[PDB]
Amino acid sequence: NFYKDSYAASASKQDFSQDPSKFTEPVVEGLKAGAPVL
Amino acid sequence: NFYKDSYAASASKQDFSQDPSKFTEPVVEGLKAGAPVL
Amino acid sequence: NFYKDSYAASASKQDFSQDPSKFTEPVVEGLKAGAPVL
Amino acid sequence: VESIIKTATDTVKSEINAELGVVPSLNAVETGATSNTEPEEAIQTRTVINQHGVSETLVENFLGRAALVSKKSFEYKNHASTHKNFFKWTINTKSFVQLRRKLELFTYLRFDAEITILTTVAVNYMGLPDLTLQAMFVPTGALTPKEQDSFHWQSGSNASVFFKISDPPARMTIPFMCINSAYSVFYDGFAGFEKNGLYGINPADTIGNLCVRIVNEHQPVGFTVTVRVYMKPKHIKAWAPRPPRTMPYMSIANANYKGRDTAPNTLNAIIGNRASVTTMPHNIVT
Amino acid sequence: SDRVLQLKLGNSAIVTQEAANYCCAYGEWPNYLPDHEAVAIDKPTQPETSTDRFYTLRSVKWESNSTGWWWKLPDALNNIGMFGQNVQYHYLYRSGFLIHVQCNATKFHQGALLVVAIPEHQRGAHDTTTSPGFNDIMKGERGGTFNHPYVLDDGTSIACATIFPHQWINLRTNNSATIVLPWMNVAPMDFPLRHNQWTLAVIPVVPLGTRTMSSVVPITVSIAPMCCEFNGLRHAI
Amino acid sequence: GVPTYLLPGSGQFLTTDDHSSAPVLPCFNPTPEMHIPGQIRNMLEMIQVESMMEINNTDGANGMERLRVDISVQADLDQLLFNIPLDIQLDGPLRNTLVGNISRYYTHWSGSLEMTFMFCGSFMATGKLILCYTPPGGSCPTTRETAMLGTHIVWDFGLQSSITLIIPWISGSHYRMFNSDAKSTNANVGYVTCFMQTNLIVPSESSDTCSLIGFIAAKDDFSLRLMRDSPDIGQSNHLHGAEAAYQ
Amino acid sequence: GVPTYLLPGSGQFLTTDDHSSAPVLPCFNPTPEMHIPGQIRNMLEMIQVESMMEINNTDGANGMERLRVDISVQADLDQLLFNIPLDIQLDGPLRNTLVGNISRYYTHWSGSLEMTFMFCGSFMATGKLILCYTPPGGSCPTTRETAMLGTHIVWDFGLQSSITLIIPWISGSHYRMFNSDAKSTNANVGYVTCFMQTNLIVPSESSDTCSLIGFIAAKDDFSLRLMRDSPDIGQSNHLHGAEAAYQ
Amino acid sequence: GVPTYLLPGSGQFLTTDDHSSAPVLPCFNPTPEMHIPGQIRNMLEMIQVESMMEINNTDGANGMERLRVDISVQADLDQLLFNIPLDIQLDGPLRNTLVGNISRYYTHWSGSLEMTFMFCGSFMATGKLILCYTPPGGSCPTTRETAMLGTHIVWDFGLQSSITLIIPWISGSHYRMFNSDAKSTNANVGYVTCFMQTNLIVPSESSDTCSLIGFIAAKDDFSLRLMRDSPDIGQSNHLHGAEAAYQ
Ligand SMILES: CC(=O)N[C@@H]1[C@@H](O)[C@H](O[C@@H]2O[C@H](CO[C@]3(C(=O)O)C[C@H](O)[C@@H](NC(C)=O)[C@H]([C@H](O)[C@H](O)CO)O3)[C@H](O)[C@H](O)[C@H]2O)[C@@H](CO)O[C@H]1O
């Protein structure tokens, strides 16, 4: 980026962080594999 | 700046120095917080 | 390559590896020079 | 819970299961959590080292595309006796459905916007003039020009970009300029302190006005000039994904819906009908 | 173990013996506004127990032909108790919410309610280009009803509404749903009378049915604001 | 100066290009970031959430009635209850789902899918169902004896209300693709069928017709490629108010 | 040579661009710098100086009469004396001030404002006033009992001639903005009202009508964003002598 | 900015240029590589495989009859059986071979060639042949006494069914070239002739006319230069279905 303002830079396609559980498992008490959910 | 004359350079947007008091408090004797001005 | 995707790069004309025998001599038992083939 | 994912997850080989008290295939949808049954627990799997990448679905790439947001045609001529050689456009991302639907897959979005302006001309034949245009960015509800030649175009502080039709499309980046930490793609509220304001329109989410004029004085003949504006968001952060739009859009000012006349995407039926729940469409007839 | 639960805030408490764990929206939990995110500089008032407690709204009746109900927050509570008073006397407010939806029946009854907390649920009007009016949106404590739950009254779909924080009340399984909501907005605080951060929607995807004695089956909503903060004190609006 | 030459492609405007560009407002200070709940960084996170399949997409079924499949107490044995076409890239029960909608913004896909069904009858209602996934090759099975030969799960109604049928990624090629031909060897996923394993059995005071709600989602071994415009939205005219933005 | 390609934006003239350019006079030696009093480096320094508000912007008030508010000895109690609209981005008592003028070259603003009033009656005149700042939400208060509930300062006339009412930055959003709609939730700042706390009291030989001069300024927690052309100046024709510059 | 200037060649599209170019699909993840049998990295690998020469390219010889040369029991001595023109860059017995086809995509060539002949008569058939390579300069030899003076191999039929005649690279210049003139000093390779050394001799129950199949290939001292379009394929009209690709 040769511009003085950082927002002028090219895209940032390097954020590979993920946390699906905030959407897939937003339950307060974690569910263990194989164990009855209820 | 690839030009030989320095005045040809791009802008200089890095001078963050300030001294508002030369406009806001140009009084010879400094005014203390809370104390009666007069 | 100034592009972010490697597939955008210029050609790769540096692979000088060869193995003609996979086409010229795909026989299980190698043939020795001078010796009767059968 | 958070981690770095660069490829789809691998599969581990699994054996036969016959354990009392262990029922991985049973779940409870009522909890609100999605099933956590793994393939390895549902069937016997083999080991697979999965090398499939996941970068094309990164939000930056998903939304990182220059999409058409504005298209305006006007007559360039002597308007002695309508857009008189210039126009004003209140910027919005709700007029073209492809970009709109994608942005609306999210509740909040923070991004800088790369703007590209494409211009084409047609004679109303003796050749096409290489005109110079001026696109001036005028803030929200701010003072816009009323004539092709008003003093307002002097653009003392407003940013203006001058470009020729023969040059590549003009381009510049408008920073994330919301007064908040992110733009509200949806806004369940009223933009004013009184009760008669507009619903669902948060002024804070309107980038501004784009005033475009042909700088050249009119020619002896008339031309049709079309200006297309494209926007590409970058340096994107997105929050709270949402249900995709199904009903056709009706207005740029709201989410009003009506649905198609017949399925698919009719208010009464989103998916097209099949004869019955035991009728297999596209069944293989060998 | 994950079927029984007691919620206690302020002078209020609620228990359920037929729960289904409980949801923490986006895996978050309510909290007070930190100094590094604050904007309004006046010292805020944090009422605690007088506002962070359960407020039970009037019940609604689940009928065989019901389309669903909704309550917008904070609108639904803007005129209830001390939370309502603080809201009326302050220009700015901030809070999370603990939602508990209740509905019991019989082991001979069937039905399934989707209980979802929708952020920024901007309603759309049906078959017209005119945007919804103030009275179509601000229902207060009474809440409103869905005209076309199939598309969430916004041209999208209830089918994909599970992308939002939610639980279900499936009569044969549980009799209550619990969802904890953190402050959800693009600003650290907001004017409570013109913007609703969340919309609680309760929709019967599977209608109420039985062949046993017919009885009125109510659905009740109890909501407890959490970590309330108010700024910009003045007179009551 | 520096000697240079322009390459083919010079001056073009590629909508997917990636370059820096002139800042319109120099020295502009963007609003500070604030933590906001629910940040999503990869669309794959969204398709892992299960959503409702419109299995009852039939004439006579209106609105939400299309989102549930009713099963009744049977008089005959081994009864077929319903089937579900599997191309998440074509119109059908799977199209208007989170995984279906997002996948349709792409052309290639790979990974396991999961179908979860929640029984919504009364507590006194019991039953066993068999859900089968039949890999492609032939005609959809119409009898339990045939469907049973494929991938399946026998579901027993009880306290845990839902069952999950995993549709494992079983493909010759790394990815499957959409090409508008549902019978193409690189598109057809196979079939899902549901039969009574035993029967739905309920007492006199319980409804004798109960509903199931089917959900679907991608597992984390999923991958999508080749972005394209979605076929699920389009316009013929200007939207209302669009032109007023110029007045 | 070096292979290159032109990007979109090539050849354009952006008035806010920032690049070096060819020196017209090579080897030119600019006049040496000399220290000069009053250097200003950030416009925020200028808006921190308080200037006079035109509170008496009413028909019949001419010139400087508009810059002072006259208060008289009252016959009734708790009397409302005057109010002041607060949008420093719209026409009103605050527009032609240092903070108002400079702020109007921008679109977004944030920070605390300060209003200082100087009592200019005679030494023998006494009194107490209450200045109130009411955050937005409702109609402007018209009674002291209501205004008193907001942010305020009770002012006692005496040797120290001036009082300061701080209008703290109280906003939901980081910044407020101008959009020509004074009632917008992102624009309205609220109100400032002034009532008699007691009464203006003076002896027979002192004037029984006295003036206050109100000043306003930004504090150093102020910030302005998004430069735009000011609405406070404009032209329809060439200025006199402009064309003569070509003769 | 950087001062630059465009060179001649700027803006041109050279079909053999080598530069990087804008990726159409950013962040696209290509299918993982998999090992596949038979990878070829240099076309020289392909021309080293021997293929059948169409020696019997005569009127009356149809299809595969053109790929074999029949020899019969002779009544006279030292009989000439057949000859083979040698320009692998012109139409003749060597053109439709692996080495011939690939070489014709080039203009210059260098290296030794090898011709292998397989006798396909019956086991009871015997014989001796002499295969001769005559470097260029004169007319093709028509008698064994003359051909015998060049490079040659005397072949005795037996258990090992095939013989190889090496056509060593014998040229004044490093490379030979095609220029459509078969008699050019930089093109003509010379000749290959085959005579009976003794005679084909067979018993009463064996066929008295037997076939030979001749193969040719390049050795690894081969080199090809100057790519050009092959003269072996061409079109006058659109192929069937080509225009339908636009419908
Ligand atoms: C093109 C092809 O290969 N086959 C055509 C059949 O598919 C078609 O029958 C109809 O197909 C419809 C397909 O569903 C969509 C789709 O394209 O996937 C669903 C989209 O959401 C929808 N988009 C919008 C904005 O409404 C889209 C759109 O309605 C159509 O493209 C417009 O025609 O359709 C669906 O399954 C219908 O229920 C089905 O009847 C037949 C019709 O004669 O023509 C085939 O060529």
UniProtKB/Swiss-Prot annotation, chain D:
Forms an icosahedral capsid of pseudo T=3 symmetry with capsid proteins VP2 and VP3. The capsid is 300 Angstroms in diameter, composed of 60 copies of each capsid protein and enclosing the viral positive strand RNA genome. Capsid protein VP1 mainly forms the vertices of the capsid. Capsid protein VP1, together with VP3, interacts with host cell sialic acids to provide virion attachment to target host cells. This attachment induces virion internalization. After binding to its receptor, the capsid undergoes conformational changes. N-acetylneuraminate binds at R260, P264, N265. It comes from Human enterovirus D68 (EV68). Interacts with capsid protein VP0, and capsid protein VP3 to form heterotrimeric protomers. Five protomers subsequently associate to form pentamers which serve as building blocks for the capsid. Interacts with capsid protein VP2, capsid protein VP3 and capsid protein VP4 following cleavage of capsid protein VP0. The chain holds residues 565 to 860 of 2188 of the full protein. It is found in: Virion; Host cytoplasm. This is Capsid protein VP1.
